Write an enzyme that holds these catalytic residues in place. Sequence first.
Site, PDB file in Angstrom:
ATOM      1  N   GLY A 169      40.797  50.285  43.534  1.00  0.00           N
ATOM      2  CA  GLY A 169      41.634  50.201  42.345  1.00  0.00           C
ATOM      3  C   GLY A 169      42.878  51.070  42.264  1.00  0.00           C
TER       4      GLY A 169
ATOM      5  CE  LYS B  43      41.241  46.763  38.805  1.00  0.00           C
ATOM      6  NZ  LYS B  43      41.997  46.341  37.580  1.00  0.00           N
TER       7      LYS B  43
ATOM      8  CG  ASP C  15      48.004  49.803  43.451  1.00  0.00           C
ATOM      9  OD1 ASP C  15      46.839  49.636  43.034  1.00  0.00           O
ATOM     10  OD2 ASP C  15      48.969  49.085  43.067  1.00  0.00           O
ATOM     11  CD  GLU C  16      47.343  55.860  42.827  1.00  0.00           C
ATOM     12  OE1 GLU C  16      47.515  54.609  42.847  1.00  0.00           O
ATOM     13  OE2 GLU C  16      47.037  56.502  41.787  1.00  0.00           O
TER      14      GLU C  16
ATOM     15  CE1 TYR D 228      39.572  48.589  36.328  1.00  0.00           C
ATOM     16  CE2 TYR D 228      40.067  47.062  34.509  1.00  0.00           C
ATOM     17  CZ  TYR D 228      40.464  48.103  35.367  1.00  0.00           C
ATOM     18  OH  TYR D 228      41.744  48.636  35.256  1.00  0.00           O
TER      19      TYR D 228
ATOM     20  CB  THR E 170      40.139  51.864  38.932  1.00  0.00           C
ATOM     21  OG1 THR E 170      40.549  50.526  39.230  1.00  0.00           O
ATOM     22  CG2 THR E 170      41.420  52.678  38.729  1.00  0.00           C
TER      23      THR E 170
ATOM     24  CB  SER F  68      44.431  48.194  32.720  1.00  0.00           C
ATOM     25  OG  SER F  68      43.055  48.422  32.586  1.00  0.00           O
ATOM     26  CB  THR F  69      48.051  45.795  35.450  1.00  0.00           C
ATOM     27  OG1 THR F  69      47.552  46.907  36.206  1.00  0.00           O
ATOM     28  CG2 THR F  69      49.461  45.510  35.905  1.00  0.00           C
TER      29      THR F  69
ATOM     30  CB  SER G 112      49.745  47.576  38.591  1.00  0.00           C
ATOM     31  OG  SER G 112      49.991  48.847  39.160  1.00  0.00           O
TER      32      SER G 112
END
Lengths: 299, 299, 299, 299
Positions: free
Chosen positions: D191, D167, D193-194, D139, D169, D49-50, D210
């Site tokens: 997935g 993966k 990052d935050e 994913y 997310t 995606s990124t 990302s």
Amino acid sequence: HHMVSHLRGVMPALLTPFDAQQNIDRASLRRLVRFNIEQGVDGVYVGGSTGEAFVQSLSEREEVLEIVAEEAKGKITLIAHVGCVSTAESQQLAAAAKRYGFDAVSAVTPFYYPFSFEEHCDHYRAIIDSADGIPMVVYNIPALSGVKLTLEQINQLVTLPGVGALKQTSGDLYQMEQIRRAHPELVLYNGYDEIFASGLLAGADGGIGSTYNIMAWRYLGIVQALKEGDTAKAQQLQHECNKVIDLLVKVGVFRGLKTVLHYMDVLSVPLCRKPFAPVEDKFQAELKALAQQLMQERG
Amino acid sequence: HHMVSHLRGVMPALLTPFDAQQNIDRASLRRLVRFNIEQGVDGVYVGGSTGEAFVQSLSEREEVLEIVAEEAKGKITLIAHVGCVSTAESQQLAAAAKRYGFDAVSAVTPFYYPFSFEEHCDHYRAIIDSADGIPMVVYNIPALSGVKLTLEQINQLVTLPGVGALKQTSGDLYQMEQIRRAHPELVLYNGYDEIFASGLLAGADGGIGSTYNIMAWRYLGIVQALKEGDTAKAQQLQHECNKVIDLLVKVGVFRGLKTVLHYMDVLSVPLCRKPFAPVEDKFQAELKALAQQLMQERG
Amino acid sequence: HHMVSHLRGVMPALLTPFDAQQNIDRASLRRLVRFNIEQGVDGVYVGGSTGEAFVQSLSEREEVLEIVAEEAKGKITLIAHVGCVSTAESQQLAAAAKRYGFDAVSAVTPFYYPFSFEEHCDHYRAIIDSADGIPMVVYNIPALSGVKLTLEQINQLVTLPGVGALKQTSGDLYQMEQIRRAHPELVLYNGYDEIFASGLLAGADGGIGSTYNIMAWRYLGIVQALKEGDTAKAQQLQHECNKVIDLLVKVGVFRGLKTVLHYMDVLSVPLCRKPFAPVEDKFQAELKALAQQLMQERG
Amino acid sequence: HHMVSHLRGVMPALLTPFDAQQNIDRASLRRLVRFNIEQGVDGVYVGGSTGEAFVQSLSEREEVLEIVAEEAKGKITLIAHVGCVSTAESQQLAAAAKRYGFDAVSAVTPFYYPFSFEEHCDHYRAIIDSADGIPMVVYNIPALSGVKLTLEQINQLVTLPGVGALKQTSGDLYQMEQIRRAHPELVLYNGYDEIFASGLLAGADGGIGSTYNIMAWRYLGIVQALKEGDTAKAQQLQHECNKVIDLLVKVGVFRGLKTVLHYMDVLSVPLCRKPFAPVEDKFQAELKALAQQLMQERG
Ligand SMILES: [Cl-]
Ligand SMILES: [Cl-]
Ligand SMILES: [Cl-]
Ligand SMILES: [Cl-]
Ligand SMILES: [Cl-]
Ligand SMILES: [Cl-]
Ligand SMILES: [Cl-]
Ligand SMILES: [Cl-]
Ligand SMILES: [Cl-]
Ligand SMILES: [Cl-]
Ligand SMILES: [Cl-]
Ligand SMILES: [Cl-]
Ligand SMILES: [Cl-]
Ligand SMILES: [Cl-]
Ligand SMILES: [Cl-]
Ligand SMILES: [Cl-]
Ligand code: NA
Ligand code: NA
Ligand code: NA
Ligand code: NA
């Protein structure tokens, strides 16, 4: 925010025991309060969602509040969930909580009807005024309330005069971290027991949970594992809490917890109020084995 | 299903007037019933969502029910919305509706807590039992209740013994058509006023709505236009209804309706209960002009 | 909006036939265009969602557009869905549709990635530029695109220079009516076949639909019923369409349509592209029976 | 699940650099791969995606795949995101990844069109066959794909023959824990990052993200902090990561990252492909200050 540091910690969301005719079982309520104190909890959160608040009258909720204060005032922190859709009904419960000597009040974002953010804020302001000097815990549970607050709106709620904490029943741990970063002193309760360890890591400094009624030492154990940097122990404890939560989801969460407490000889009668159904017979052996496991795990 | 044809039609979801201290304004309530009767409605739906049921006590809801029956029994059809989260509270209101001579009861799917479909059916069964021979209207409003019923679940609810109608507050007009095709005899009320004409065309044979309190004749006009085959007139009437609903969404729907009724000299006090705020002053002129327009349009 | 009235009408969303190896079946594509012309449709919508656009290369979509133009230019209205996520890919297809002589282009709101409203607007402007003088149909399908436009944003899209129509695949018929009321001349296509009659009554003046490939005359008949004022006929035709749609939902909508067309001797191979699976054997008898019924229904 | 432990770790979701005319900037792509290797990452995730995969052609995605393998084969782990909506297109990219020597392939659950769970499984099986010996990373990204998998379906996906990792997310860290508990050996990438620190604690053993392109050492530092039992250090690193993520959400995430990389003299041109807009001028000072801070923090 620092002058209400005594609100931090691990606090069961108290179940409200009912008798065979679905009326308040006062003797079982007192036993459950004493059982939680003996578990080592920091506080109790009374008449919340887990307390079956929204299938009780105001009079019933006041009776429960007063009994718990009798049992627990001066021994552990007392938080009264006073929230109703109606502002005036919430104010009545807050004034009562003040008379009984509670350390704090709490209110769920008013639900069913869509209210504007300004209407939510004035609702909290009115309840805070009726609490007459004890702090407010904003209670955020979007999955049941249907209220989808932005971060900036949460920021404004927790900075209203009189607000001393946030009960954050959200699985969004980005927002948990953003609330902590924006309010380093805020008392911030993790509300989803199944992510307790991760919620602490993301910024919560305690928790309010239904399953603490039957295994609070595991959640206290996770707090201590994380302070001690024993992340593998925190994960192991959370795995065990979540095995229990998987079972509770299968059988019905509040009725499953009440049934365990019945097998622990704490609650005489494990019923929820209708429309919650009773526990299905085929699940009783598992709930009884869980009760016995938990009792043996303490000594 | 054939024996409850007397429940079909256009029925306002009655507002509950309050006084300046937010208590029930009995005098204004009586005049609102009479006003609705004078509009030519087929019935009234009392103590629903629009009635602000969920910011009232049971005692208050009973008081409203009994007053409306005094004014309207024998003149128009009477439907009591007795729904609460609690089954036992709903049963108390159903037994009261029966004592007052209502023609049917109704209950929203119980909300806030997630309940299984089987728990929903037993809830309706218990209320039907306490209603003691008057039919039940199932009340489906997913946007506010959070209960997302499938077509097949809806099919099982409307065939429970004692169920005579469905209040369908859903904008899904595929499901409206499927419900009509599976139950050709079912009394089926359109619940979103802003799609009334399309909802009738998709299978509804009537409607229950908040905005019928101020302009029921437009909705009766839409019924007539479609029966007559004047599709253009039906569209024009819906356009005019939706210009009004646009305004009511901007100002707040229940308080906007009550304000219009205040400017029609029906209600003395146009307040909703907190946490609904009052109407903003900048909207008063528009609401007064709407009342004037509607009164001149009437005759 | 006045100078594009020739876009109004009932237009099948053309399926893209494939052969046994999943390559485009050009001969079957030609037969399907011809079959639709003979059904009396007002136009065709090529390379849309129903056309399996997003499992095709740009070169394949261009070959399909050119063929449809050969078969139908000057006989029915030609609309090319050129939309991709990429703006430059969409422009390439728009420039191609212009070379082939299409009467209009159309683009779905770009999806997968979240884009701001201004990014959506610029995307449409660039495609309109590459379409070099043929009007644009904005294509709104929130259920699949995940783009949730406000009413006011729709108002700005349909007023961009070069936009001549809106394909409205939303079941929200309040918004349908609001769009009609704000834009009395806008060409407004109902996108959900299962509410076509109600969608016209709410303000659409035509439709684009996948099921028009096998039974366009029923939708044309709904248009005629409403113009005539035969609301009962429109309802009965919608009932029949929805009985078919029920079956298509059970078997898979695109593959079920292609299978019907196969049994009508239009398509050689009724496959969709992977990951769509083939139709289960147990549904073949039903689909063949529907093919026979629709064929006898015509003559 | 044990014979692919070489897939565990911290792997940037590689951005695809473009030139001033939006074609691939091959020279900047090579320096981006080298920059990430020099950050100490465990691997790279290419064409996800990124990577703006869904605004690129199959030919462009293969070009990027082949360039990255040339720079990084045998230095760090290589994962090729080969996912498309089309199964055949996905198979083409998997065969290419295999030719170029990738260590694993990955595919997003196919999107836009609703597919059944069985159609998803067959999609993965077909890609796995074409990948011809290298493991598959499932994913999962419900917020963008719209594919809402249950826990039991996820369990079946990761036990498909040839699947070596997930993966994940998803912000649901109950499900994260349940997956770990059900599959103790599974390679499980966080997935979002935050919530990286919390995601690890909930059971993830690595991450694909990302923002790792500009500050991988912070995420590597969080892994190390949690292994060393420095929960406070992990929390501080996550706070800093999230301060950056806040800024990237405000300016646009992909274009913000590429702008930072431009101010790091890694990417010559920081453009995303249309319909992504360029960064607003008023954000340039902050993004440049961020670049400087990250460069000075590295040492
Ligand atoms: Cl008093
Ligand atoms: Cl006391
Ligand atoms: Cl809100
Ligand atoms: Cl901590
Ligand atoms: Cl005991
Ligand atoms: Cl009585
Ligand atoms: Cl349900
Ligand atoms: Cl009718
Ligand atoms: Cl060319
Ligand atoms: Cl040509
Ligand atoms: Cl948007
Ligand atoms: Cl019409
Ligand atoms: Cl043939
Ligand atoms: Cl080749
Ligand atoms: Cl699915
Ligand atoms: Cl770890
Ligand atoms: Na305490
Ligand atoms: Na009547
Ligand atoms: Na035409
Ligand atoms: Na590696």
